[PDB]
A = this chain, B = another copy of it.
Amino acid sequence: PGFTISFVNKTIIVTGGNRGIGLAFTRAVAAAGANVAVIYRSAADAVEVTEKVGKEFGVKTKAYQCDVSNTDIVTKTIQQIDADLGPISGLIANAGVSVVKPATELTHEDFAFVYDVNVFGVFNTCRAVAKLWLQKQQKGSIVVTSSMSSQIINQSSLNGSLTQVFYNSSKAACSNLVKGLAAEWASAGIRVNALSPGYVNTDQTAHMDKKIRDHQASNIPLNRFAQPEEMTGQAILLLSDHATYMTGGEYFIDGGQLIW
């Protein structure tokens, strides 16, 4: 016996999944038996990484160069993906960026950068996929990758902020957006939810400032940064049919940071 979730013959779209957390979602869903599309921006080795993933788990994988902030480019990639692997069963909007500068120095360009990917993009992908499912009367489940930063401001030092007000605020927008979409699409048997990670280990971490990184680790009850691997379980559940009564919600994987 055992609790089993299977995505065999099912395709899940996953943005920014050629690396970082996206790659964790990539493998996880695949390992669960899913065909997977890795949307990326300019990763030189994205097509490779994808291929490697698909051959390791015995599933159908294909990468796609695509700036989620671009309406038409996203509306096509989605139409295409649905021809290479349709019909679509689930989506995981994870592509995200950030700017770190004192608030007084943030420029319009910075705002645009962050919000076009971290907020407009998420919206863009969801609408695209939703219209499709709506058009063909297909049900679906969407998982938006937010952050605990939707609730708190991160620290870079004791009582000292990690300056990225556009990032944190874009994540708040993100988590709220999930509710707005779930609200309109619920009647169409379409579910939308947010997964919000805490401090996670990624390649960039080993190259960040150590005084900072340590401090960030000093106030986590679990006493450590997460591994991207620790974010996928909640996603599978959210995508699975076990979650028919779950929509418009935000699910934190913060290691207890939000307790303090």
- Point out residues on A near B: beta carbons under 8 Å: 1-8, 28, 31-33, 57-59, 69, 71, 102-104, 106-108, 111, 115, 119-120, 123-124, 127, 130-131, 134, 150-153, 155, 158-159, 161, 163-166, 168-177, 179-187, 198, 218-223, 226-227, 230-234, 236-237, 240, 242-249, 251-256, 258-260
Contacts and interface: CB of A to CB of B under 8 A. Distances in A.
A164 B180 CA distance: 8
Contacts of A252: 246, 249
A152 B227 CA distance: 25
6 contacts: A2-B6, A103-B130, A153-B179, A153-B259, A161-B183, A234-B243
Nearest to A232: B242
Given A7-B2, A230-B242, A171 B176 contact: yes
B218 A159 contact: yes
A234 to B, nearest CB: 6
A33 B246 contact: no
A186 B103 CA distance: 13
B177 A219 contact: no
A155 B220 CA distance: 12
B230 A3 contact: no
Given A176-B168, A219-B158, A119 B111 contact: yes
B182 A165 contact: no
A221 B169 contact: no
B127 A103 contact: yes
Which of A184, A252, A260 has its CB near the most chain B CB atoms (within 10 A)?
A: A260
Contact of A184 (B102, B158, B243): B102
Given A4-B2, A168-B176, A169-B176, A256 B103 contact: no
A258 B254 contact: no
A110 to B, nearest CB: 10
A31 B71 CA distance: 45
A242 B233 contact: yes
A173 B245 contact: no
A259 B182 contact: yes
A242 B239 CA distance: 15
